[PDB]
Design a protein around this ligand. Structure first.
Ligand SMILES: *[C@@H]1O[C@H](CO)[C@@H](O[C@@H]2O[C@H](CO)[C@@H](O[C@@H]3O[C@H](CO[C@H]4O[C@H](CO)[C@@H](O)[C@H](O)[C@@H]4O)[C@@H](O)[C@H](O[C@H]4O[C@H](CO)[C@@H](O)[C@H](O)[C@@H]4O)[C@@H]3O)[C@H](O)[C@H]2NC(C)=O)[C@H](O)[C@H]1NC(C)=O
Ligand SMILES: *[C@@H]1O[C@H](CO)[C@@H](O[C@@H]2O[C@H](CO)[C@@H](O[C@@H]3O[C@H](CO)[C@@H](O)[C@H](O)[C@@H]3O)[C@H](O)[C@H]2NC(C)=O)[C@H](O)[C@H]1NC(C)=O
Ligand SMILES: *[C@@H]1O[C@H](CO)[C@@H](O[C@@H]2O[C@H](CO)[C@@H](O[C@@H]3O[C@H](CO)[C@@H](O)[C@H](O)[C@@H]3O)[C@H](O)[C@H]2NC(C)=O)[C@H](O)[C@H]1NC(C)=O
Ligand SMILES: *[C@@H]1O[C@H](CO)[C@@H](O[C@@H]2O[C@H](CO)[C@@H](O)[C@H](O)[C@H]2NC(C)=O)[C@H](O)[C@H]1NC(C)=O
Ligand SMILES: *[C@@H]1O[C@H](CO)[C@@H](O)[C@H](O)[C@H]1NC(C)=O
Ligand SMILES: *[C@@H]1O[C@H](CO)[C@@H](O)[C@H](O)[C@H]1NC(C)=O
Ligand SMILES: *[C@@H]1O[C@H](CO)[C@@H](O)[C@H](O)[C@H]1NC(C)=O
Ligand SMILES: [Ca+2]
Ligand SMILES: [Ca+2]
Ligand SMILES: [Ca+2]
Ligand SMILES: [Ca+2]
Lengths: 884, 673
């Protein structure tokens, strides 16, 4: 919501197809593209570098080889930050092979180094069918820690792919094999984007025309693999699902969290366009572009999703924000949109801003074709955005959004009843109340210390009992029922107290007198014009009110004793693990064994990991809550805890009457809180707490956490029975491979237990059994023999040929694990020469021995979520059918 | 029934509260010191209170069917619906449509001229005497036109240089015409033999990329009949190509980022703009095309049959025709055209303003009893059998008088549906009783609406200086309640809720108890922001199509549906466009259970009971083996391979489908003893 629409820079260089494709160069400069900037004989176009200092674009020197013809360079662009480099491209090279020419593509790497050219400049000599004649490589490019990556389209049956270039090492390439029958004419690699991770990188290609609809495919490059991770078909035919793609970072952990997709030509009733949010689940063969949502707009033929780029943190709420083009909006006019992240895989459908081509863009037809931002180029602190348009390209800076916290208090807590009911011999002695308000700004990370982040002027507007046409007081400075004064703020508080005049005689006293402020940011001149316009955030509670109670007349005497108690509980709450039990139902009862409490308030103390949400229940219940109440959460303690006050808004709590209401606290699935969480409940009257020992009520609960821990019996399991059984040999070792993995969301130690039969009445079943742990460090495992109940095993297995550990002296393996990181598919197998001797001991055939494998973890602190999943107890049944 | 009180100042503000809100005009209904808002309750409550039945106002939506004489319009009646629509209340008016016959036809043959369409050009170059013959039965003197097309001139769609451009023909080079994209060879004419001979003339051409660029030709055709000419009655087209089709976005390959304008600009019945011009977007036809009452008839190879099949879903009035690569059975396409092209009765409307929402019903002739949905898709009606669409128009607010139209896609019959903002209820005037309201106010159905400065149920008091003792009787809900629930100062018995200049904030009620801000939130928005729902005294009244405590289950729709159109596949209720997959089945639509062991055990007994006949063991089979299907095809996915009842390794894949233990197997015709 902070994208400048007044004081910006504009580069209108008229060079044919200028401002058709743009990218953020090394922070100092922005590179635009003009593919159709005719040069020589139907040849290239040309590039232009532009600086902010002076509003002008200088041509860029280039050694365009005679080989590359009609390549119209600049069409495809891409820039990295790693070391600062840039990549321009002619995706339309023409090389005459006689009978018919084709299209190869030629790119150029610039920067503060050597001017490389890298397909690389092995001018692609000449040779239904196709291979790589019209692949126009470089049609779309994107960097990555291990060398750039250009995209081919006409690979073979126009399937597609992308050529990776390493560090001077010969490049590789990734198509979809041929065994992949489909994917004919899909332009796989029309758009390309990175997907860095805490682990290895990941590429993504856009296939607008997979089966003529559009699919997007993601690839991984595992050691000696380079296979496919996953993919998702399109939603509609012609929708063009795959046009644009952008890996964006909802937070700032540096691991790519989700990925956007384009489909400008999509609809069902309104052809606005379509962009698709698609998080990056880990664990191949499963991946959904349907983490719910997909942004649009109410305007047909808009081409929404034509382009888009990560912009980053602009509003400073730790939630990256993105930009999206739509040059088809309005009457062909241009348009752009701004969205924000939320928590993890998600975005906000409702955009905050919609800067379109109506923004005293005098006359540009379609703007927003392409755009890339995130880099600070004007060197005024925060990031900038670059949006290309037909003819010219604009730069929109991000205006600083600071927000402020406020404190309100009335020096005279309440009213002493002195100037209360008053009298009419002699005066109005108008009591003098003081009200001190303070203003301080705290959330500052982006703007950093120094100019701007400090000095600002503000307009204040205090007003008492606004809603009523009966002003219960007035300020002295102005004598009015309200006042205004412009004063200087800082990151350091600014407290000023004002004088208030209460008339000796007044009607209503029960209802405290309200005092609210309207505050903004007046003037906006601050030293240099390097700030121009600051502003406030979305959640700007610019209306902050504080109440002043009265000493209620509790009689001609009787002194007015404030006596209220409180006690609450958790009906049915069992164990409370983070993941299940999201909502937290609290049943609070309360007393009034003293004088009537009017504006009685009830505040709670709780760890950051939860807040209050209105119940609003109806339908019906019970002997129970009825109750309109006003609650305001707010941070309190030094570090971690904070209070959610809740004053029973509009009615009285009389006599020794008790009342019970229900207050529910949502708890986050990632709730940071000790192994125990406590919470209290301060209870008092509107007349504050005049005395000594508080009547707070607390209780402390054991806390656990949700985890998903599953284990399967890999199909590399030895079921080997066969008739050749002449003697009693030893070694046809069986192999029980078990694979395990946790789809939880927290790293947690575990210990995988096992059960392998051996001794059977002195007659070993299978000997020297140990457990290998490949693809992973040499871990420590335990071993212990145990003897079953010793029932009549004769008839036992006659029921069922099975040989569980309950018959034969089993063997437990306790394989401990340091930290079973989430997503880790840590797997391992066990083998041992399987003896044939014991087979006769039971006098039957077609017997089968079973091993049980069961994973465990500290029952306390951690626990499995869904109810109860036995997915942490696999089994493998081998068979020893050997006749004759 | 149901009625929550919004700010009630008049009979109209009681109406703007909800459907189940009624108003009483009977005077002397207000007690010694009772609120005026009490007059606005539910019809039942009013009778229980004493309010007469004939005193209960209830202004309702209805429809005006001003039918025409005849020949005004043909089979879309009524022709003029002047509805009087009250907000929130739906007005219903029926639509009788009894198609008749066949009007003057006007065909156009869009044929792809490639080297693959050679024997097509031969077996079709002049078979038009049987077209008018096939046209003779139903329609009379129709029209016949032709238009050729290939693909964009410039690469990468076809080699632009050099003189293979002059001679694209592969190997034979039988003097094929230069690479083109759209050449209007024949205009709509009466003659038939002249048409045939003008076709055989031109020979094929050729291009590089496999799919064609036939879409660019589509627009150019129905773009400017100021040079091509078109009948003012019917206009049928027919797509023909043994190749794909390029749409917008592909043009970026040929260094062209100028989108499609929509109008054709030819100088010699031949395009010379498609090069400096981008491809028509996929959806740029269902609009422009359907606007000029034109409808293509897909007829291509069986290789491209189910790709145009998905295209039939989107664009209206379009049939699929799988034919041989010789285009010999091309005339039978139109026996299948009128078959289900005179069948798709459509009933959409001009893009209405957001302040309105329209729906329809459907009663097809052959059995179908549909209800509530846009369009009028009834693919079971043809010649002379009427149909029934129940159009239900509802508003959200008191619209401004305007007018829209409900046309049948592919028909010139415009139905001018007028719309009148109906939002009033009408009684009396200020000649009767200038007395009551103490002269400073008028009277309307009992109560008195005072001036700007006067207020009260009889314009008696002033907003400057009043109170009494037990006037605070009905001024507080109960004896243990604060007066006017605070946030409201009592005057003359009743309360005048205070005002807050904060967005949304608004107090109201007899005792100023209810506000429109303190309800249940959702996505950091009150009752789901202004879009989803609204706030009214705690409870959220979610807009239509949204339910839940705070519109939490945003949509009443079902995105939980897959292409199978069965909710959440196997298991999982569809709550708020989400599935609750049973067991370890994962999202979104519950198909893949990644953790499931892979039970081939217990299945071997039944595998040799279906393919092989080695004795249904436990009992029989088809009873202990509800994996009912055993397709004689190469299904795959769960490649299983275990043993049989006695030794032999029986191989077999296992493709599960949808719900619970439902499966589909192919047991290899092989064993291994
Ligand atoms: C990336 O994507 C491609 C396509 O999607 C995968 O499949 C390749 O597809 C082509 C299809 O044509 C395979 O065929 C290759 O043809 C080359 C030359 O044409 C021959 O075949 C045509 C058609 O039959 C004839 O008209 C013509 O006369 C030729 O006989 C061959 O040179 C290729 O090499 C083969 O022989 C050479 C001998 O030197 C061997 O070294 C090769 O291993 C191979 O056997 C080939 O015959 C081609 O086989 C496919 N490539 C591969 C690697 O299998 C690719 O698989 C995929 N690439 C990667 C790395 O995954
Ligand atoms: C704090 O809030 C109050 C009220 O919201 C400000 O008082 C004045 O409020 C009105 C809105 O009721 C402002 O709007 C006026 O509106 C019309 C358009 O509807 C516009 O044409 C006028 O120019 C005017 O803006 C009005 O601006 C505002 N008064 C001033 C001086 O801006 C009050 O100003 C706020 N406190 C501040 C700014 O310190
Ligand atoms: C009910 O509870 C809250 C918090 O317990 C009271 O709010 C304010 O809480 C802070 C503590 O965070 C009090 O400050 C001090 O606590 C520290 C130790 O953390 C201690 O060093 C100080 O001596 C003091 O106790 C603060 O006093 C308190 N606010 C007020 C106005 O007293 C809240 O006051 C309680 N509700 C009531 C009293 O109605
Ligand atoms: C590049 O080629 C184009 C044609 O593809 C030239 O444009 C014109 O083409 C026509 C048809 O061949 C010629 O008769 C004209 O003489 C061309 N125009 C002009 C002004 O020369 C174009 O000229 C070529 N460009 C260059 C500079 O080689
Ligand atoms: C004085 O009070 C009046 C009425 O409340 C208000 O309109 C006006 O702005 C005030 N004047 C000053 C100087 O504050
Ligand atoms: C429209 O048709 C339906 C079904 O025949 C009928 O029930 C309904 O009364 C009709 N509506 C009007 C407005 O005549
Ligand atoms: C008023 O309210 C209640 C409900 O009828 C009753 O229990 C009580 O005695 C009343 N109080 C007075 C002081 O009349
Ligand atoms: Ca991230
Ligand atoms: Ca941010
Ligand atoms: Ca900057
Ligand atoms: Ca053919």
């Amino acid at each position: 919501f902070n994208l400048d629409t007044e004081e910006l820079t504009a580069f209108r260089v008229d060079s044919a197809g200028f401002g058709d494709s743009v990218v953020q160069y090394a922070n100092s400069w922005v590179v635009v593209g003009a593919p159709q900037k005719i040069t020589a004989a139907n040849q290239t176009g040309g590039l232009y570098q532009c600086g902010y200092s002076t509003g002008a674009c200088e041509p860029i020197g280039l050694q365009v080889p005679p080989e590359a013809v009609n390549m119209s360079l600049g069409l495809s662009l891409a820039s990295t930050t790693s070391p600062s480099q840039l990549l321009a491209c002619g995706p339309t090279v023409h090389h005459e092979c006689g009978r018919n020419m084709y299209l190869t593509g030629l790119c150029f790497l610039l920067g503060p180094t050597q001017l490389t050219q890298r397909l690389p400049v092995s001018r692609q000599e000449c040779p239904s069918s196709f291979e790589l004649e019209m692949a126009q490589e470089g049609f779309s490019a994107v960097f990555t820690p291990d060398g750039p990556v250009l995209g081919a389209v006409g690979s073979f049956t126009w399937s597609g792919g992308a050529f990776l270039y390493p560090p001077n090492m010969s490049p590789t390439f990734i198509n979809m094999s041929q065994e992949n029958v489909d994917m004919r004419d899909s332009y796989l690699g029309y758009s390309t984007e990175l997907a860095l991770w805490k682990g290895v990188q990941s590429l993504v290609l856009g296939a607008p025309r997979y089966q003529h609809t559009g699919k997007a495919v993601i690839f991984t490059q595992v050691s000696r693999q380079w296979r496919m991770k996953a993919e998702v078909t399109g939603t509609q035919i012609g929708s063009y699902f795959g046009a644009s793609l952008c890996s964006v970072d909802v937070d700032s952990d540096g691991s790519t969290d989700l990925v956007l997709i384009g489909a400008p030509h999509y609809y069902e009733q309104t052809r606005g366009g379509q962009v698709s949010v698609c998080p990056l689940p880990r664990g191949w063969r499963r991946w959904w572009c349907d983490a719910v949502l997909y942004g649009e707009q109410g305007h047909p033929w808009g081409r929404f999703g034509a382009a888009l780029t990560v912009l980053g943190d602009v509003n400073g709420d730790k939630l990256t924000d993105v930009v999206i083009g739509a040059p088809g909006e309005e009457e062909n006019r241009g348009a752009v949109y701004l969205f924000h992240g939320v928590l993890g895989p998600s975005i906000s459908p409702s955009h905050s801003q919609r800067i379109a081509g109506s923004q005293l863009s005098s006359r540009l037809q379609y703007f927003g074709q392409a755009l890339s931002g995130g880099q600070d180029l004007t060197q005024d602190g925060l990031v900038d955005l670059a949006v290309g348009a037909r003819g010219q390209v604009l730069l929109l800076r991000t205006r600083p959004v600071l927000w402020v916290g406020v404190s309100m208090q009335f020096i005279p807590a309440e009213i002493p009843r002195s100037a209360f009911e008053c009298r009419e011999q002699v005066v109005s002695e108008q009591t003098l109340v003081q009200s001190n308000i303070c203003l301080y700004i705290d959330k500052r990370s982006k703007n950093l210390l120094g100019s701007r982040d400090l000095q600002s002027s503000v307009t204040l507007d205090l007003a008492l009992d606004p809603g009523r046409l009966s002003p219960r007081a007035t300020f002295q400075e102005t004598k009015n029922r309200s006042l205004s004064r412009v004063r200087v703020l800082g990151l350091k508080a600014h407290c000023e107290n004002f004088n208030l005049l209460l008339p000796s005689c007044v009607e209503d006293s029960v209802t405290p007198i309200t005092l609210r402020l309207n505050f903004t940011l007046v003037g906006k001149p601050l030293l240099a014009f390097r700030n121009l316009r600051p502003m406030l955030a979305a959640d700007a509670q610019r209306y902050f009110t504080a109440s002043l109670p009265f000493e209620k007349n509790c009689g001609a005497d009787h002194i007015c004793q404030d006596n209220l108690g409180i006690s609450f509980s958790f009906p049915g709450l069992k164990s409370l693990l983070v993941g299940s039990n999201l909502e937290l139902n609290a049943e609070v009862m309360v007393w009034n064994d003293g004088e009537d409490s009017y504006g009685t308030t009830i505040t709670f103390s709780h760890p950051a990991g939860l807040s209050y949400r209105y119940v609003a229940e109806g339908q019906k219940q019970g002997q129970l809550r009825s109750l309109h109440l006003t609650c305001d959460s707010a941070p309190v303690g030094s570090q971690g805890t904070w209070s959610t006050s809740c004053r029973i808004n509009h009615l009285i709590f009389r006599g020794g009457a008790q009342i019970t209401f229900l207050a529910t606290f949502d708890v986050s699935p990632k709730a940071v809180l000790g192994d125990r969480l406590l919470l209290t409940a301060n209870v008092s009257s509107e007349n504050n707490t005049p005395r000594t020992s508080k009547t707070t009520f607390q209780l402390e609960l054991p806390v656990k956490y949700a985890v998903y821990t599953v284990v399967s019996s890999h199909e590399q399991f030895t079921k080997y029975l066969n008739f050749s059984e002449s003697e009693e040999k030893e070694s046809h070792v069986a192999m029980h491979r078990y694979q395990v993995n946790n789809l939880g969301q927290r790293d947690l130690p575990v210990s995988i237990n096992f059960w392998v039969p051996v001794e059977l009445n002195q007659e070993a079943v299978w000997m020297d059994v140990e457990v290998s742990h490949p693809q992973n460090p040499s871990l420590r495992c335990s071993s212990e023999k145990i003897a079953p109940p010793a029932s009549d095993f004769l008839a036992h297995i006659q029921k069922n040929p099975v040989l569980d550990c309950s018959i034969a002296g089993c063997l437990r393996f306790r394989c401990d694990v340091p930290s079973f990181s989430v997503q880790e598919e840590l797997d391992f197998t066990l083998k041992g020469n399987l003896s044939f001797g014991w087979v006769r001991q039971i006098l039957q055939k077609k017997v089968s021995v079973v091993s049980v494998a069961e994973i465990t973890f500290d029952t306390s602190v951690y626990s499995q979520l869904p109810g109860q999943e036995a997915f942490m107890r696999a089994q493998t049944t081998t068979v020893l059918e050997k006749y004759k | 029934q149901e009625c929550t009180k919004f700010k009630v100042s008049s009979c109209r503000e009681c109406i703007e509260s909800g459907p189940g809100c009624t108003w009483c005009q009977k005077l002397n209904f207000t007690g010694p010191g009772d609120p005026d808002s009490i007059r606005c309750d539910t019809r039942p409550q009013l009778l229980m209170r004493g309010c007469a039945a004939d005193d209960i106002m209830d202004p309702t939506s209805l429809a005006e069917t001003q039918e025409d004489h005849n020949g005004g319009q043909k089979q879309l009646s009524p022709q003029k619906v002047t509805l009087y629509l009250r907000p929130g209340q739906a007005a219903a008016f029926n639509v009788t449509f009894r198609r008749a016959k066949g009007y003057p036809i006007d065909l156009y043959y869009l044929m792809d001229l490639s080297y693959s369409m050679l024997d097509d050009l031969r077996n079709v170059k002049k078979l038009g005497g049987d077209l008018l013959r096939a046209l003779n039965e139903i329609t009379e003197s129709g029209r016949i036109g032709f238009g050729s097309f290939v693909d964009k001139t410039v690469l990468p769609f076809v080699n632009t240089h050099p003189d293979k451009l002059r001679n694209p023909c592969p190997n034979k080079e039988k003097e094929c015409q230069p690479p083109f994209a759209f050449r209007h060879v024949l205009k709509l004419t009466n003659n038939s033999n002249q048409f045939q001979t003008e076709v055989g003339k031109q020979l094929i051409s050729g291009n590089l990329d496999a799919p064609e660029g036939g879409l660019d030709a589509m627009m150019q055709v129905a773009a400017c009949p100021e040079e091509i000419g078109w009948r003012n009655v019917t206009r049928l087209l027919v797509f023909a190509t043994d190749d794909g089709f390029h749409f917008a976005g592909d043009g970026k390959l040929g260094a062209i980022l100028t989108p499609n304008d929509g109008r054709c600009h030819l100088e010699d019945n031949l395009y010379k703009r498609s090069n400096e011009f981008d491809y028509p977007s996929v959806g740029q036809l269902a609009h422009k095309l359907a606007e000029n009452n034109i409808q293509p008839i897909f007829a291509v190879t069986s290789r491209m049959v189910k790709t145009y099949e998905k295209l039939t879903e989107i664009i209206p009035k379009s049939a699929v025709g799988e034919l041989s690569e010789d285009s010999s059975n091309v005339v039978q396409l139109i026996k299948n055209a009128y078959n289900k092209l005179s069948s798709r009765v459509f009933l959409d409307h001009n893009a209405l303003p957001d302040t309105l929402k329209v729906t329809y019903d459907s009663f097809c002739s052959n059995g179908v009893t549909h209800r509530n949905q846009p369009r009028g898709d009834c693919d079971g009606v043809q010649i002379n059998v009427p149909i029934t669409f129940q159009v239900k128009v509802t508003a959200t607010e008191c619209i401004q008088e305007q007018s829209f139209v409900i046309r049948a896609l592919g028909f010139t019959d415009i139905v001018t549906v007028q719309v009148l903002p109906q939002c009033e209820c009408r009684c009396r005037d200020q000649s009767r009783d200038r007395s009551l309201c103490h002269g400073k106010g008028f009277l309307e159905c009992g109560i008195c609406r005072c001036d700007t400065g006067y207020i009260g149920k009889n314009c008696e008091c002033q907003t400057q200086g009043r109170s009494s003792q037990e006037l605070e009787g009905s001024c507080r809900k109960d004896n243990n309640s604060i007066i006017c629930s605070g946030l409201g100062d009592c005057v003359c018995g009743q309360c005048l809720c205070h005002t807050s200049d904060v967005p949304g904030k608004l107090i109201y009620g007899q005792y100023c108890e209810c506000d429109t801000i303190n309800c249940e939130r959702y996505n950091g928005q009150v009752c789901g922001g202004p879009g989803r729902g609204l706030c009214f005294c705690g409870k959220c009244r979610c807009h239509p199509g949204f339910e839940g405590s705070a519109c939490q289950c945003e949509r009443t729709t079902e995105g939980c549906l897959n292409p199978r159109r069965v909710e959440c596949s196997g298991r999982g209720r569809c709550r708020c466009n989400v599935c609750e997959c049973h067991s370890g089945y994962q999202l979104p639509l519950c198909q893949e259970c990644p953790g499931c062991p892979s039970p081939c055990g217990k299945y071997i007994s039944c595998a040799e009971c279906l393919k092989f006949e080695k004795g249904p063991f436990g009992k029989n089979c088809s009873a202990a083996c509800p994996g009912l299907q055993l397709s004689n095809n190469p299904v795959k996915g769960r490649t299983c391979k275990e043993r049989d009842s006695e030794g032999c390794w029986v191989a077999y894949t296992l493709e599960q489908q949808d719900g619970m233990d439902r499966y589909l197997i192919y047991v290899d015709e092989s064993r291994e003893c």
